[model samples]
Target: ELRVGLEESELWLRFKELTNEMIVTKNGRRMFPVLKVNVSGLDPNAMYSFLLDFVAADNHRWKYVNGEWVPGGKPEPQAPSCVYIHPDSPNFGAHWMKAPVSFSKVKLTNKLNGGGQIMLNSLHKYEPRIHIVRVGGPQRMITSHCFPETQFIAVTAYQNEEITALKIKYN
Candidate 1:
């Protein structure tokens, strides 16, 4: 069961236009654009695991000014890395294909002290990714997908007024 793919990237890009800044804390913050996807092509009988991880989208840091994201400076020390395993992992393909896969419950932080929290570099751009792993099958298989357009700069506080306005607009 090596087959796997995603259905939506445009929706993610649109979300990017609105843009966002994740609020990283000493504790942790929930990722807003929680990874959501529709996966297809899998073995119905085989079980699979869904995971989410955050990775640096770029090496540069960014700040919001002139109504756009601009280079802030070099990136700061990045947070420790971690993977978030979906709660319903090891579910059958039939279960995964039945609905849109989501990792909305996942969170982020700059803290280097937790087990499951994804550590990220504050002020640096990052992308949250989805990894589909085939389990309980004859062999282990892994497929990964990411939405670059959905990339955003993480911050200890909001730097862009648009992000605040967008949040208010959506709220």
Candidate 2:
């Protein structure tokens, strides 16, 4: 069976406990505690493509009150959906399994058509998911994986002081 494992899972768990906050800017902001993963069980000669997408975790907009996130009004109009494809895509499965795949280059923005950056709505929660597609196959198969620890709230600025401290300490 195909498998995908989270990289830096311990760090992701720490952020999850604090309710991770990802900063989004008009230009683009790179994700801290970058999303990375390891793969296994793919046919060695098969070619594959890796993609990353964000889904709204919930319908509520969020607010930081007294250092904690609280449900606010309805979420802001959702930004256009976008996916970030791995630059080294369409590689053989053997190559993909040889090393950890990193999405470190992916960036988030709040502006529409932000020049290849993934657009997100500030103050909304989102869960990042990975999709794997087999290339040049008679039947294309898309396998997706989601880690709850990777869920986060989009923000213009860090809302929790502890999260900020931790990000500074470890990032």
- Residue-level error in angstroms, candidate 2, position 149: 0.7
Flag clash pairs in model 1: none
Q: What is the overall TM-score of model 2 with all chains considered together?
A: 0.94
Give the per-residue lDDT digits (tens) of candidate 1, residues 1-171: 344444455555655776757888877777655556777787778899998877877667776777777875565565535788998997999999888887767767887865666777777887777788988778998898776766778889887676767655543
Taking the tens digit of each residue's C-alpha lDDT, what string does model 2 give over 1-171? 998999899999999999999999898999999988999999889999999999888778989998789987655555535989988998999988999999988889988863669998888899999899998988899999987889999999998989999899997
**What RMSD value applies to candidate 1?**
2.9
Best by lDDT: 2
Model 1 stretches astray by more than 4 angstroms: 1-11, 65-67, 72-80
Cα-based RMSD of candidate 2: 1.6
Position 26, candidate 2: lDDT: 90
Candidate 1 displacement at residue 120 in angstroms: 0.7
TM values, all candidates: 0.82, 0.94
